[PDB]
Scaffold this active site. Structure first.
Site, PDB file in Angstrom:
ATOM      1  N   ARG A 327      -7.318  -4.160 -12.767  1.00  0.00           N
ATOM      2  CA  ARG A 327      -6.349  -3.070 -12.756  1.00  0.00           C
ATOM      3  C   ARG A 327      -5.478  -3.159 -13.994  1.00  0.00           C
ATOM      4  O   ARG A 327      -4.702  -4.102 -14.133  1.00  0.00           O
ATOM      5  CB  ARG A 327      -5.478  -3.063 -11.486  1.00  0.00           C
ATOM      6  CG  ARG A 327      -4.464  -1.906 -11.484  1.00  0.00           C
ATOM      7  CD  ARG A 327      -3.992  -1.517 -10.062  1.00  0.00           C
ATOM      8  NE  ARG A 327      -3.029  -2.471  -9.502  1.00  0.00           N
ATOM      9  CZ  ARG A 327      -2.274  -2.228  -8.432  1.00  0.00           C
ATOM     10  NH1 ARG A 327      -2.354  -1.059  -7.797  1.00  0.00           N
ATOM     11  NH2 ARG A 327      -1.433  -3.147  -7.996  1.00  0.00           N
ATOM     12  N   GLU A 420      -1.528   7.639  -5.719  1.00  0.00           N
ATOM     13  CA  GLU A 420      -0.279   6.993  -5.357  1.00  0.00           C
ATOM     14  C   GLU A 420       0.934   7.703  -5.943  1.00  0.00           C
ATOM     15  O   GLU A 420       2.007   7.132  -6.015  1.00  0.00           O
ATOM     16  CB  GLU A 420      -0.295   5.514  -5.745  1.00  0.00           C
ATOM     17  CG  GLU A 420      -0.360   5.203  -7.243  1.00  0.00           C
ATOM     18  CD  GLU A 420      -0.442   3.700  -7.480  1.00  0.00           C
ATOM     19  OE1 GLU A 420      -0.851   3.280  -8.582  1.00  0.00           O
ATOM     20  OE2 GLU A 420      -0.124   2.935  -6.539  1.00  0.00           O
ATOM     21  N   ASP A 448       3.649   2.963  -3.560  1.00  0.00           N
ATOM     22  CA  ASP A 448       4.054   3.746  -4.735  1.00  0.00           C
ATOM     23  C   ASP A 448       4.206   5.217  -4.363  1.00  0.00           C
ATOM     24  O   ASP A 448       5.090   5.908  -4.863  1.00  0.00           O
ATOM     25  CB  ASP A 448       3.017   3.637  -5.844  1.00  0.00           C
ATOM     26  CG  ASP A 448       3.375   2.599  -6.899  1.00  0.00           C
ATOM     27  OD1 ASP A 448       4.552   2.498  -7.299  1.00  0.00           O
ATOM     28  OD2 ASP A 448       2.455   1.889  -7.346  1.00  0.00           O
ATOM     29  N   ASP A 619       3.817  -5.963  -3.702  1.00  0.00           N
ATOM     30  CA  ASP A 619       3.985  -5.924  -5.145  1.00  0.00           C
ATOM     31  C   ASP A 619       5.228  -5.119  -5.513  1.00  0.00           C
ATOM     32  O   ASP A 619       6.071  -4.817  -4.655  1.00  0.00           O
ATOM     33  CB  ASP A 619       2.719  -5.410  -5.846  1.00  0.00           C
ATOM     34  CG  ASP A 619       2.399  -3.948  -5.522  1.00  0.00           C
ATOM     35  OD1 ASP A 619       3.277  -3.233  -4.992  1.00  0.00           O
ATOM     36  OD2 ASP A 619       1.261  -3.502  -5.823  1.00  0.00           O
TER      37      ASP A 619
HETATM   38  O1  LIG Z   1      -1.235  -2.743  -2.413  1.00  0.00           O
HETATM   39  C1  LIG Z   1      -0.820  -2.619  -3.515  1.00  0.00           C
HETATM   40  C2  LIG Z   1      -0.758  -1.212  -4.123  1.00  0.00           C
HETATM   41  N1  LIG Z   1      -0.723  -1.113  -5.376  1.00  0.00           N
HETATM   42  O2  LIG Z   1      -0.842   0.141  -5.957  1.00  0.00           O
HETATM   43  N2  LIG Z   1      -0.710  -3.780  -4.411  1.00  0.00           N
HETATM   44  C3  LIG Z   1      -0.636  -5.186  -3.976  1.00  0.00           C
HETATM   45  C4  LIG Z   1      -1.383  -6.253  -4.796  1.00  0.00           C
HETATM   46  C5  LIG Z   1      -1.298  -7.746  -4.423  1.00  0.00           C
HETATM   47  C6  LIG Z   1      -0.444  -8.195  -3.209  1.00  0.00           C
HETATM   48  C7  LIG Z   1       0.320  -7.128  -2.384  1.00  0.00           C
HETATM   49  C8  LIG Z   1       0.239  -5.635  -2.756  1.00  0.00           C
HETATM   50 BR1  LIG Z   1       1.252  -4.335  -1.701  1.00  0.00          BR
HETATM   51 MG   LIG Z   2       0.800   1.063  -6.581  1.00  0.00          MG
END
Ligand SMILES: O=C(/C=N/O)Nc1ccccc1Br
Ligand SMILES: [Mg+2]
Ligand SMILES: [Mg+2]
Ligand SMILES: [Mg+2]
Length: 713
Positions: A327, A420, A448, A619
């Site tokens: 990503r 998102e 998001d 995150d």
């Molecule tokens: O789920 C998401 C969404 N991101 O767009 N990212 C994420 C990555 C690693 C640990 C926890 C999360 Br919540």
């Molecule tokens: Mg996100």
């Protein structure tokens, strides 16, 4: 200074050296040609990158002003016509099918868990890559999926009573997933292979599988195998037989463990789960991504493929690794890893595409064994935080240009589209169309999406509480609409339809109970934060036939534009004063808990206890939600700036306490305005309404850079 001049660019030396000495050798790309390409791509695409960002701001200003001039429940017809007039809501294109080719089976066909981890953390990344196969016994014994009730609690050593429940749970899973013609795995005494068929011994007789085609293979002697391999809904299940093991010795058939194929794919994340604010941080990330693709990343090490005997007696192999995406960051941020002659930073998204793409070439060739990643020749890039079809088209064109620099065939670089952001949601079909020859997934990044929902309608009025958002009409329509759009574009058999992350890392019983809803909704994949969680989530794909679910949803239209556009405004007198305080405390604690590790330690994802001490693994998006929600309540007079201050003051020592046992931790309390982390948290809330689309990176990056500079002297 310490920068390298390439045309109009001034490249941080550490990045230049890393690329020359580590990333380029073995790719057969002329270094001179690569760097001239970097400079040209940056020069050519930077203007439209900026134009896109300015367009976001212009749309938001118009919407802000639409709400400010209104006193009247929203007139949906008017609001829509307005969004259409300004170019927010674009015409829906005609029906089409995606043409994306050269994609691996894990993506086109296999339904299963998708694991997301911070690429800055070598250990987690290696564990994630190796999470393609995981122990069901470890995942059950080690978590609350088997309740820690009296007698069955975990101790310093092996608990037999608990281990027997683990065994029982797994035997039941086997009965549900690969049924016998008669009897239950619960009563099996042995497994053998006779004439190419699995034979299961019961106390009174023997039996075969109700569906013998689910017998996939075995290891060891056919008459006394060391393992039996089964398959169900495209996913493998391996029974390890070993009576001379601590668990096998207690077992009626000598069964040691049940291994599940778990994290089918993994996303190595350079975005919201990491803190990377300069060349040094980017290089650590890029180097880990290199090590994964070359197969030489070491803490331990990457797994090899798994050998089996076919039912008839021949030999075959199954992948031992999770197929990797990376990503990249989205369109917003610049990074000083490269600056131009004027000293202005270069767009980081453009950089990631060049460097992660370059690095990915190593995963397409022999590791100094077989190639690590894509046998079909694709590079899988997740692109976050895009707003609308012109931004998706820009990403495709960026990838096109990089492919030329890198000497790759066009469309090598595939795109996992995060849905998102609201402008992508309500134009989703056009977003898919703009990437119709590159798209390998769509995924509802719901956190998001919630942040963007709040910011977009900031001026409308007070929003519902944070924990209410997940059940709001808009988000439930958004989830259904995403699936509908994917299926209608022919994703079934071609690309993943994904849903979002389970963040409660200790609440595995709850995950097992509730997250089944995502593949029931037709999602061929969904996110988990850990190998353990991937193994447990895998259970859901054995229970639910996703391919059948998707076939049955075809042609359906479960969500209207009106439902998608239903703003989550709080009703009149929604909250008692104590409920308000609680929400303020909840959000301030969330912000502080996350920001303190981000600013002070450069950690972007980790197990952070919430206000009720539930362990969450979120995150940066959780920060976007909380900061925007508090900004929204402050904006509309629900709380005061002193309410915010008081809650931050109250919550900080609690966060400090919660971080005891952290060697490098420095308390925020009671010297608040001595703590850059604390000031960042304050700034995120108070300047929240003025950040573009509510994004937290501009403030977070600045504050982290401030912390690093203070720590140097
Ligand atoms: O789920 C998401 C969404 N991101 O767009 N990212 C994420 C990555 C690693 C640990 C926890 C999360 Br919540
Ligand atoms: Mg996100
Ligand atoms: Mg509410
Ligand atoms: Mg079935």
């Amino acid at each position: 200074t310490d920068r390298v001049s390439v045309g109009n660019l001034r490249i941080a030396r550490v990045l230049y050296d890393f690329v020359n000495n580590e990333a380029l050798p073995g790719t057969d790309i002329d270094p001179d040609s690569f760097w001239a390409g970097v400079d040209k791509v940056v020069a050519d695409l930077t203007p439209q990158n900026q134009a896109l960002l300015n367009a976001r701001d212009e749309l938001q200003a118009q919407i802000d002003k639409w709400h400010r001039r209104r006193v009247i429940p929203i007139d949906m017809d008017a609001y829509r016509q307005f969004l259409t007039e300004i170019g927010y809501l674009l015409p829906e294109p005609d029906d089409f099918t995606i043409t994306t080719s050269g994609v691996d089976a894990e993506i086109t066909t296999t339904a299963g868990p998708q694991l997301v981890v911070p690429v800055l953390n070598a250990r987690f990344a290696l564990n994630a890559a190796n999470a393609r196969w995981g122990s069901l016994y470890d995942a059950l014994y080690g978590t609350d999926v088997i309740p820690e009730t009296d007698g069955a609690e975990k101790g310093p050593t092996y608990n037999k009573v608990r281990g027997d429940k683990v065994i029982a749970y797994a035997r039941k899973f086997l009965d549900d997933s690969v049924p016998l013609s008669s009897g239950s795995f619960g009563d099996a005494t042995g497994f053998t292979v006779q004439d190419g068929q699995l034979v299961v011994a019961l106390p009174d007789k023997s039996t075969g599988l109700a569906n013998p085609g689910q017998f996939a293979g075995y290891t060891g002697a056919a008459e006394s195998p060391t393992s039996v391999l089964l398959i169900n809904h495209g996913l493998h299940i391996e029974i390890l037989i070993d009576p001379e093991s601590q668990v096998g010795t207690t077992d009626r058939a000598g069964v040691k463990d049940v291994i599940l194929e778990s994290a089918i794919t993994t996303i190595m994340d350079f975005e919201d789960s990491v803190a990377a604010v300069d060349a040094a941080d980017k290089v650590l990330g890029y180097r880990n991504w290199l090590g994964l693709n070359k197969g030489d990343l070491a803490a331990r090490v990457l797994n090899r493929d798994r050998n089996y005997t076919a039912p008839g007696g021949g030999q075959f192999t199954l992948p031992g690794r999770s197929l990797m995406f990376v990503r990249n960051v989205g369109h917003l941020m610049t990074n000083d890893a490269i600056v131009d002659t004027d000293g202005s930073e270069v767009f980081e998204g453009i950089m990631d595409a060049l460097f992660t793409g370059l690095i990915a070439i190593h995963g397409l060739k022999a590791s100094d064994g077989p190639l690590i990643n894509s046998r079909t020749g694709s590079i899988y890039i997740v692109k976050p935080k895009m707003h609308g079809p012109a931004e998706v088209a820009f990403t495709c064109e960026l990838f096109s240009r990089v492919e030329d620099v890198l000497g790759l065939p066009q469309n090598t670089m595939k795109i996992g589209i995060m849905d998102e952001e609201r402008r992508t949601t309500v134009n989703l079909k056009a977003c898919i169309k703009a990437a119709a020859d590159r798209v390998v997934f769509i995924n509802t990044g719901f956190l998001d999406r919630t942040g963007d929902e709040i910011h977009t309608s900031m001026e409308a009025g007070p929003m519902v509480r944070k924990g209410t958002m997940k059940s709001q009409p808009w988000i439930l329509a958004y989830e259904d609409h995403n699936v509908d759009a994917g299926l209608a574009a022919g994703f079934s058999g071609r690309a993943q339809v994904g849903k979002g992350m389970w963040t409660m890392t200790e609440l595995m019983a709850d995950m097992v109970e509730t997250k089944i809803a995502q593949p029931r909704a037709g999602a061929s994949t969904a996110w988990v934060p850990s190998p353990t969680a991937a193994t447990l989530h895998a259970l859901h794909y054995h229970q639910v036939d996703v391919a059948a679910v998707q076939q049955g949803l075809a042609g359906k239209r479960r969500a209207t534009i009106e439902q998608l556009l239903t703003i989550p405004l709080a009703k009149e007198l929604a909250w008692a004063p104590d409920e308000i305080r609680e929400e303020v405390d909840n959000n301030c604690q969330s912000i502080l808990g996350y920001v303190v590790r981000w600013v002070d330690q450069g950690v972007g994802a980790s197990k952070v206890p919430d206000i009720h001490d539930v362990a969450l693994m979120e995150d940066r998006a959780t920060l976007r939600i909380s900061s925007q929600l508090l900004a929204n309540w402050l904006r509309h007079g629900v709380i005061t700036s002193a309410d915010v201050r008081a809650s931050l003051e109250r919550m900080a020592p609690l966060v400090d306490r919660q971080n005891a046992g952290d060697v490098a931790y420095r308390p925020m309390a009671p010297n608040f305005d001595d703590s850059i982390a604390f000031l960042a948290a304050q700034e995120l809330i108070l300047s929240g309404a003025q950040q573009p689309n509510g994004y937290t990176e501009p403030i977070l990056h600045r504050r982290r850079r401030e912390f690093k500079a203070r720590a140097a002297e």
